[PDB]
Write an enzyme that holds these catalytic residues in place. Structure first.
Site, PDB file in Angstrom:
ATOM      1  N   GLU A  69     -10.279  -1.924   1.351  1.00  0.00           N
ATOM      2  CA  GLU A  69      -9.366  -2.296   0.276  1.00  0.00           C
ATOM      3  C   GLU A  69      -9.727  -1.369  -0.892  1.00  0.00           C
ATOM      4  O   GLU A  69     -10.907  -1.204  -1.226  1.00  0.00           O
ATOM      5  CB  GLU A  69      -9.538  -3.764  -0.111  1.00  0.00           C
ATOM      6  N   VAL A  70      -8.719  -0.724  -1.457  1.00  0.00           N
ATOM      7  CA  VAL A  70      -8.882   0.288  -2.493  1.00  0.00           C
ATOM      8  C   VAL A  70      -8.364  -0.202  -3.841  1.00  0.00           C
ATOM      9  O   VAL A  70      -7.256  -0.744  -3.937  1.00  0.00           O
ATOM     10  CB  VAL A  70      -8.222   1.611  -2.024  1.00  0.00           C
ATOM     11  N   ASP A  78      -9.330  13.130  10.450  1.00  0.00           N
ATOM     12  CA  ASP A  78      -8.229  12.250   9.991  1.00  0.00           C
ATOM     13  C   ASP A  78      -7.333  12.981   8.982  1.00  0.00           C
ATOM     14  O   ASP A  78      -6.930  12.405   7.985  1.00  0.00           O
ATOM     15  CB  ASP A  78      -8.769  10.887   9.434  1.00  0.00           C
ATOM     16  N   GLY A 128      -6.610  -0.146   4.071  1.00  0.00           N
ATOM     17  CA  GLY A 128      -6.636   0.465   5.390  1.00  0.00           C
ATOM     18  C   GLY A 128      -7.214  -0.500   6.389  1.00  0.00           C
ATOM     19  O   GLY A 128      -7.494  -1.653   6.049  1.00  0.00           O
ATOM     20  N   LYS A 129      -7.443  -0.042   7.619  1.00  0.00           N
ATOM     21  CA  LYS A 129      -8.063  -0.913   8.626  1.00  0.00           C
ATOM     22  C   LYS A 129      -9.514  -1.193   8.235  1.00  0.00           C
ATOM     23  O   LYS A 129     -10.001  -2.293   8.497  1.00  0.00           O
ATOM     24  CB  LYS A 129      -8.006  -0.266  10.022  1.00  0.00           C
ATOM     25  N   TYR A 130     -10.186  -0.217   7.563  1.00  0.00           N
ATOM     26  CA  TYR A 130     -11.602  -0.343   7.220  1.00  0.00           C
ATOM     27  C   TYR A 130     -11.907  -0.715   5.741  1.00  0.00           C
ATOM     28  O   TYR A 130     -13.075  -0.994   5.420  1.00  0.00           O
ATOM     29  CB  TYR A 130     -12.359   0.946   7.636  1.00  0.00           C
ATOM     30  N   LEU A 155      -4.924  -0.633  -5.369  1.00  0.00           N
ATOM     31  CA  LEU A 155      -4.192   0.610  -5.140  1.00  0.00           C
ATOM     32  C   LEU A 155      -3.680   0.714  -3.717  1.00  0.00           C
ATOM     33  O   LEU A 155      -2.665   1.370  -3.474  1.00  0.00           O
ATOM     34  CB  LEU A 155      -5.079   1.833  -5.427  1.00  0.00           C
ATOM     35  N   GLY A 156      -4.424   0.137  -2.782  1.00  0.00           N
ATOM     36  CA  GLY A 156      -4.090   0.218  -1.372  1.00  0.00           C
ATOM     37  C   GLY A 156      -5.108  -0.427  -0.472  1.00  0.00           C
ATOM     38  O   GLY A 156      -5.996  -1.158  -0.927  1.00  0.00           O
ATOM     39  N   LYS A 181     -13.581   1.825  -3.293  1.00  0.00           N
ATOM     40  CA  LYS A 181     -13.247   1.541  -1.900  1.00  0.00           C
ATOM     41  C   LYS A 181     -14.214   0.469  -1.396  1.00  0.00           C
ATOM     42  O   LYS A 181     -15.385   0.775  -1.099  1.00  0.00           O
ATOM     43  CB  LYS A 181     -13.376   2.830  -1.082  1.00  0.00           C
TER      44      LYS A 181
HETATM   45  C1  LIG Z   1     -10.532   5.691  -0.841  1.00  0.00           C
HETATM   46  C2  LIG Z   1     -10.268   6.140   0.569  1.00  0.00           C
HETATM   47  O1  LIG Z   1     -11.125   6.720   1.224  1.00  0.00           O
HETATM   48  N1  LIG Z   1      -9.107   5.685   1.112  1.00  0.00           N
HETATM   49  C3  LIG Z   1      -7.840   5.345   0.555  1.00  0.00           C
HETATM   50  C4  LIG Z   1      -7.388   5.771  -0.691  1.00  0.00           C
HETATM   51  C5  LIG Z   1      -6.221   5.242  -1.244  1.00  0.00           C
HETATM   52  N2  LIG Z   1      -5.754   5.620  -2.524  1.00  0.00           N
HETATM   53  C6  LIG Z   1      -6.274   6.463  -3.492  1.00  0.00           C
HETATM   54  C7  LIG Z   1      -5.479   6.686  -4.620  1.00  0.00           C
HETATM   55  C8  LIG Z   1      -5.893   7.558  -5.629  1.00  0.00           C
HETATM   56  N3  LIG Z   1      -5.106   7.885  -6.739  1.00  0.00           N
HETATM   57  C9  LIG Z   1      -3.793   7.296  -6.990  1.00  0.00           C
HETATM   58  C10 LIG Z   1      -3.254   7.330  -8.362  1.00  0.00           C
HETATM   59  C11 LIG Z   1      -3.722   6.050  -7.774  1.00  0.00           C
HETATM   60  N4  LIG Z   1      -7.134   8.165  -5.430  1.00  0.00           N
HETATM   61  N5  LIG Z   1      -7.801   9.028  -6.275  1.00  0.00           N
HETATM   62  C12 LIG Z   1      -8.885   9.402  -5.549  1.00  0.00           C
HETATM   63  C13 LIG Z   1      -9.021   8.669  -4.358  1.00  0.00           C
HETATM   64  C14 LIG Z   1     -10.082   8.724  -3.409  1.00  0.00           C
HETATM   65  N6  LIG Z   1     -10.919   8.786  -2.640  1.00  0.00           N
HETATM   66  C15 LIG Z   1      -7.847   7.931  -4.259  1.00  0.00           C
HETATM   67  N7  LIG Z   1      -7.464   7.060  -3.310  1.00  0.00           N
HETATM   68  C16 LIG Z   1      -5.415   4.408  -0.478  1.00  0.00           C
HETATM   69  C17 LIG Z   1      -5.840   3.983   0.769  1.00  0.00           C
HETATM   70  C18 LIG Z   1      -7.036   4.470   1.304  1.00  0.00           C
HETATM   71  N8  LIG Z   1      -7.423   4.141   2.690  1.00  0.00           N
HETATM   72  C19 LIG Z   1      -8.312   3.017   2.905  1.00  0.00           C
HETATM   73  C20 LIG Z   1      -6.345   4.339   3.755  1.00  0.00           C
HETATM   74  C21 LIG Z   1      -5.927   5.793   3.900  1.00  0.00           C
HETATM   75  N9  LIG Z   1      -6.958   6.603   4.583  1.00  0.00           N
END
Ligand SMILES: CC(=O)Nc1cc(Nc2cc(NC3CC3)n3ncc(C#N)c3n2)ccc1N(C)CCN
Length: 331
Positions: free
Chosen positions: A51-52, A155, A47-49, A44-45, A67
């Site tokens: 992989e999602v 943040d 960050g620096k800390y 899904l994505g 995460k």
């Molecule tokens: C998980 C987290 O703490 N960070 C994070 C989350 C995401 N993406 C997503 C995307 C979705 N839903 C979308 C339809 C797919 N969801 N649903 C709940 C959560 C949570 N928690 C979440 N997180 C992308 C990058 C990051 N980080 C590392 C960089 C930005 N700070």
């Protein structure tokens, strides 16, 4: 002489009144789930800390967000975990569902409730005046809650706000930078994304508090009502303060520096210059006027102050006229 100390004007001693265990995350023992309950579906994505990924919990067929953490000090993982557990069930706070570890790699992973998010770079351009007031009120519920619970998010930005527009569901996510507020504590100023850094971070004033999240919220609100992203577009951390000074003016900045006896980095002396405080009207044009109102401007003004002690608290912000119709519709 050194800088003048500062205390949060609300929820000052809430952690002091709690048992040590509540905020002393260094001694937190992590409760681990079963890694085999989850199968990763897709990335899904990142960050620096971390992989999602999107995953499926195979014991109940529910969609989750995983995460996977990159190498980080165990006390920082304990901090994120402890904060998520303390805030669980709180209004609009993401739910931490589980915590797992790969038995071979020893890599930890945090499992979150899934939100059917619409990317902000697509959603924001469709938001009406009412939607911005509605979603800003939902973020404030999350901030007043975590602040009342002795925690600063540190943040607050569009990427950490998950919105399921169809269900008008909002969650404040990524508590990886969040800290416990303790009066007299000096915090690391190298936190938050450049464009959302409060003036206290840019001048290196370490004794900050919950009010830092209110500056970040103001940056978010300005980008949404003016359709100008980012609102304060610095080239680096020094120029970031120059971008703020060109809007808020240099006079209130030097009054702030003098009030707290802040030793201003010598680099700043030749770049800050002299600037007047601008009127919000210069960012108003035909493509954003439908989102800008006198009450949006009054509210924004009360968030974006150099002096952290003078910004609205999240509870004061909820009582602002900008939210009268949202409050009425919720009753
Ligand atoms: C998980 C987290 O703490 N960070 C994070 C989350 C995401 N993406 C997503 C995307 C979705 N839903 C979308 C339809 C797919 N969801 N649903 C709940 C959560 C949570 N928690 C979440 N997180 C992308 C990058 C990051 N980080 C590392 C960089 C930005 N700070």
């Amino acid at each position: 002489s050194g800088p003048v100390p500062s205390r949060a004007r609300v929820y000052t001693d809430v952690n002091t009144h709690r048992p040590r265990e509540y905020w002393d995350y260094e001694s937190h023992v992590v409760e681990w789930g079963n890694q085999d309950d989850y199968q990763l579906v897709r990335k899904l994505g990142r960050g620096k800390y971390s992989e999602v990924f999107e995953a499926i919990n195979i014991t109940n067929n529910e969609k989750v967000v995983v995460k996977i953490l990159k190498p980080v000090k165990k006390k920082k993982i304990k901090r994120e975990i402890k904060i998520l557990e303390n805030l669980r069930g709180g209004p609009n706070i993401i739910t931490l569902a589980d915590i797992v570890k790969d038995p071979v790699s020893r890599t930890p992973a945090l499992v979150f409730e899934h939100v059917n998010n619409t990317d902000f770079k697509q959603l924001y351009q469709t938001l009406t005046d009412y939607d911005i007031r509605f979603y800003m009120y939902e973020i404030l519920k999350a901030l007043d809650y975590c602040h009342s619970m002795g925690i600063m998010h540190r943040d607050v930005k569009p990427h950490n706000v998950m919105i399921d527009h169809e269900h008008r569901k909002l969650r404040l996510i990524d508590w990886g930078l969040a800290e416990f507020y303790h009066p007299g504590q000096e915090y690391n100023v190298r936190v938050a994304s450049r464009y959302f850094k409060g003036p206290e971070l840019l001048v290196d004033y370490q004794m900050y508090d919950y009010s830092l999240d209110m500056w970040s919220l103001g940056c978010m609100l300005a980008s949404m009502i003016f359709r100008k992203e980012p609102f304060f577009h610095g080239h680096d951390n020094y120029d970031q303060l120059v971008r703020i000074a060109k809007v808020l003016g240099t006079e209130d900045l030097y009054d702030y520096i003098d009030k707290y006896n802040i030793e201003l980095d010598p680099r700043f002396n030749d770049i800050l210059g002299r600037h007047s405080r601008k009127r919000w009207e210069r960012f108003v044009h035909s493509e954003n006027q439908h989102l800008v109102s006198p009450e949006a401007l009054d509210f924004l003004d009360k968030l974006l102050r150099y002096d952290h002690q003078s910004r609205l608290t999240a509870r004061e912000a909820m009582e602002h006229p900008y939210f009268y119709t949202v409050v009425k519709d919720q009753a």
